[PDB]
């Protein structure tokens, strides 16, 4: 009875672990582009001034 | 054992909603970031 419980728990923990590394990846790709676009907009302002 | 499993099932249900809530938030961010980079790119052209 406990083996069926522990076995589903471990399965779910494994999908959760992937969800956390997936989310950190998406958040890194977002930080990188946000900061890229911030620099482009800064560089334009620099040139325009 | 029903007490562990009902507590487990309740947590997993909340987690699943959090995943879809995170993915929706990520979509919205991906949308606005993209539209703002268009705005800037057509500004530059001009």
């Amino acid at each position: 009875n406990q083996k069926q419980i522990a076995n589903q728990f471990n399965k779910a923990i494994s999908q959760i672990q992937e969800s956390l590394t997936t989310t950190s990846t998406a958040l890194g790709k977002l930080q990188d582009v946000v900061n890229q676009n911030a620099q482009a907009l800064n560089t334009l302002v620099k040139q325009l001034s | 054992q029903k007490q562990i499993a009902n507590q487990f099932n309740k947590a997993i249900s909340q987690i699943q909603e959090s995943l879809t809530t995170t993915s929706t938030a990520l979509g919205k961010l991906q949308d606005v970031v993209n539209q703002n980079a268009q705005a800037l790119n057509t500004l530059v052209k001009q």
Binding site: I5, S19, A40 | T20, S23, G27, Q30, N36
Partner: peptide
């Protein structure tokens, strides 16, 4: 000069896949 596009649409998809997958863990 140029602003980049972000592509996390694979990450967004995977999280919705994992949400569906967690059902096969309920009891």
């Amino acid at each position: 000069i140029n602003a980049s596009v972000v592509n996390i649409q694979k990450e967004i998809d995977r999280l919705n896949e994992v949400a569906k997958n967690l059902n096969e863990s309920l009891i």
